[PDB]
Design an enzyme around this catalytic site. Structure first.
Site, PDB file in Angstrom:
ATOM      1  N   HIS A  12     -97.612 -27.952 100.868  1.00  0.00           N
ATOM      2  CA  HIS A  12     -96.090 -28.562 101.178  1.00  0.00           C
ATOM      3  C   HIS A  12     -96.321 -30.012 101.462  1.00  0.00           C
ATOM      4  O   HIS A  12     -95.587 -30.505 101.505  1.00  0.00           O
ATOM      5  CB  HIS A  12     -95.491 -27.928 100.411  1.00  0.00           C
ATOM      6  CG  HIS A  12     -95.572 -26.704  99.345  1.00  0.00           C
ATOM      7  ND1 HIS A  12     -95.163 -26.701  98.325  1.00  0.00           N
ATOM      8  CD2 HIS A  12     -95.495 -25.333  99.445  1.00  0.00           C
ATOM      9  CE1 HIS A  12     -94.937 -25.795  97.838  1.00  0.00           C
ATOM     10  NE2 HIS A  12     -94.933 -24.934  98.840  1.00  0.00           N
ATOM     11  N   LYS A  41    -101.518 -25.155  89.364  1.00  0.00           N
ATOM     12  CA  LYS A  41    -100.662 -24.972  89.337  1.00  0.00           C
ATOM     13  C   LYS A  41     -99.576 -26.094  88.751  1.00  0.00           C
ATOM     14  O   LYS A  41     -99.682 -27.103  89.625  1.00  0.00           O
ATOM     15  CB  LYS A  41    -100.274 -24.503  90.671  1.00  0.00           C
ATOM     16  CG  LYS A  41     -99.281 -24.126  91.477  1.00  0.00           C
ATOM     17  CD  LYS A  41     -99.192 -23.825  92.905  1.00  0.00           C
ATOM     18  CE  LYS A  41     -97.992 -23.645  93.487  1.00  0.00           C
ATOM     19  NZ  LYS A  41     -97.222 -24.306  94.523  1.00  0.00           N
ATOM     20  N   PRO A  42     -98.492 -25.200  87.831  1.00  0.00           N
ATOM     21  CA  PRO A  42     -97.947 -26.124  87.393  1.00  0.00           C
ATOM     22  C   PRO A  42     -96.786 -27.344  87.937  1.00  0.00           C
ATOM     23  O   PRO A  42     -97.291 -28.439  87.374  1.00  0.00           O
ATOM     24  CB  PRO A  42     -97.205 -24.778  85.927  1.00  0.00           C
ATOM     25  CG  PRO A  42     -98.796 -23.607  86.061  1.00  0.00           C
ATOM     26  CD  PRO A  42     -98.259 -24.008  87.637  1.00  0.00           C
ATOM     27  N   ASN A  44     -95.277 -28.129  92.074  1.00  0.00           N
ATOM     28  CA  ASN A  44     -95.671 -28.251  93.204  1.00  0.00           C
ATOM     29  C   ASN A  44     -94.679 -29.390  93.671  1.00  0.00           C
ATOM     30  O   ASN A  44     -95.367 -30.750  93.252  1.00  0.00           O
ATOM     31  CB  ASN A  44     -97.190 -28.098  93.836  1.00  0.00           C
ATOM     32  CG  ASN A  44     -97.847 -27.422  95.262  1.00  0.00           C
ATOM     33  OD1 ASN A  44     -97.211 -26.962  95.320  1.00  0.00           O
ATOM     34  ND2 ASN A  44     -97.600 -29.354  95.499  1.00  0.00           N
ATOM     35  N   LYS A  66     -83.505 -18.352  96.630  1.00  0.00           N
ATOM     36  CA  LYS A  66     -83.535 -18.037  94.608  1.00  0.00           C
ATOM     37  C   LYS A  66     -84.202 -16.098  94.862  1.00  0.00           C
ATOM     38  O   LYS A  66     -83.012 -15.899  94.072  1.00  0.00           O
ATOM     39  CB  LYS A  66     -85.096 -18.734  93.928  1.00  0.00           C
ATOM     40  CG  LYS A  66     -84.170 -20.108  93.811  1.00  0.00           C
ATOM     41  CD  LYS A  66     -84.898 -21.105  93.266  1.00  0.00           C
ATOM     42  CE  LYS A  66     -84.516 -22.174  92.918  1.00  0.00           C
ATOM     43  NZ  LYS A  66     -86.384 -23.335  92.184  1.00  0.00           N
ATOM     44  N   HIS A 119     -92.403 -20.964 102.212  1.00  0.00           N
ATOM     45  CA  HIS A 119     -91.291 -20.525 101.096  1.00  0.00           C
ATOM     46  C   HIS A 119     -91.354 -22.183 100.771  1.00  0.00           C
ATOM     47  O   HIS A 119     -90.216 -22.104 101.128  1.00  0.00           O
ATOM     48  CB  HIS A 119     -91.485 -19.358 100.507  1.00  0.00           C
ATOM     49  CG  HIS A 119     -90.765 -19.597  99.593  1.00  0.00           C
ATOM     50  ND1 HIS A 119     -91.379 -19.441  98.276  1.00  0.00           N
ATOM     51  CD2 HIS A 119     -89.751 -20.049  98.492  1.00  0.00           C
ATOM     52  CE1 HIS A 119     -91.051 -19.922  97.141  1.00  0.00           C
ATOM     53  NE2 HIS A 119     -89.477 -19.795  97.593  1.00  0.00           N
ATOM     54  N   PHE A 120     -91.476 -22.771  99.668  1.00  0.00           N
ATOM     55  CA  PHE A 120     -90.902 -23.825  99.643  1.00  0.00           C
ATOM     56  C   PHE A 120     -90.232 -23.593  98.738  1.00  0.00           C
ATOM     57  O   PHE A 120     -90.469 -23.414  96.957  1.00  0.00           O
ATOM     58  CB  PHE A 120     -91.001 -25.136  99.042  1.00  0.00           C
ATOM     59  CG  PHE A 120     -90.946 -26.197  98.877  1.00  0.00           C
ATOM     60  CD1 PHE A 120     -89.967 -26.756  97.570  1.00  0.00           C
ATOM     61  CD2 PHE A 120     -90.343 -27.534  99.585  1.00  0.00           C
ATOM     62  CE1 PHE A 120     -89.487 -27.913  97.164  1.00  0.00           C
ATOM     63  CE2 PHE A 120     -89.839 -28.285  99.273  1.00  0.00           C
ATOM     64  CZ  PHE A 120     -89.392 -28.275  97.926  1.00  0.00           C
ATOM     65  N   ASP A 121     -89.001 -23.294  98.522  1.00  0.00           N
ATOM     66  CA  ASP A 121     -87.951 -22.560  98.113  1.00  0.00           C
ATOM     67  C   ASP A 121     -87.330 -24.081  96.102  1.00  0.00           C
ATOM     68  O   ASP A 121     -87.249 -23.795  95.613  1.00  0.00           O
ATOM     69  CB  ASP A 121     -86.373 -22.222  98.308  1.00  0.00           C
ATOM     70  CG  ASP A 121     -85.583 -21.181  97.013  1.00  0.00           C
ATOM     71  OD1 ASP A 121     -86.702 -20.260  97.295  1.00  0.00           O
ATOM     72  OD2 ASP A 121     -84.907 -21.332  97.177  1.00  0.00           O
TER      73      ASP A 121
END
Length: 124
Positions: A12, A41-42, A44, A66, A119-121
């Protein structure tokens, strides 16, 4: 293993540039960060701010994640980001993405000591 913080940085963080320029940034970035390795990876997102500014989000606006955990934080400021999303025709192993530059607030999950993003939410 790779730590969660390290994985977040691989997936990220792109502090190199202030934005995405060539509209195959995603194609090259997704490849160099090992995100087309086993599959495409669909989706990002890449953040184009200093690591210090990103880690600082962990002391900004606390929100639910989430998944319903409550260790998520939303950036007070908008940040320079690039949304990478695989094309409708992309198929592994020739992964194709469109690059969308944007300025938006990020939401990250933070954990651990030091208390940094793991984590990128979302972007909002």
């Amino acid at each position: 293993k790779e730590t969660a913080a390290a994985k977040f940085e691989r997936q990220h963080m792109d502090s190199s540039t202030s934005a995405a320029s060539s509209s195959n940034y995603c194609n090259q970035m997704m490849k160099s960060r090992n995100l087309t390795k086993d599959r495409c990876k669909p989706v990002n997102t890449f953040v184009h701010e200093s690591l210090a500014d990103v880690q600082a989000v962990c002391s900004q606006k606390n929100v639910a994640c989430k998944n319903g955990q409550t260790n998520c934080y939303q950036s007070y400021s908008t940040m320079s980001i690039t949304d990478c999303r695989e094309t409708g025709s992309s198929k592994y192993p020739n992964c194709a993405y469109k690059t969308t530059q944007a300025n938006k607030h990020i939401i990250v999950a933070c954990e651990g000591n030091p208390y940094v993003p793991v984590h990128f939410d979302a972007s909002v």
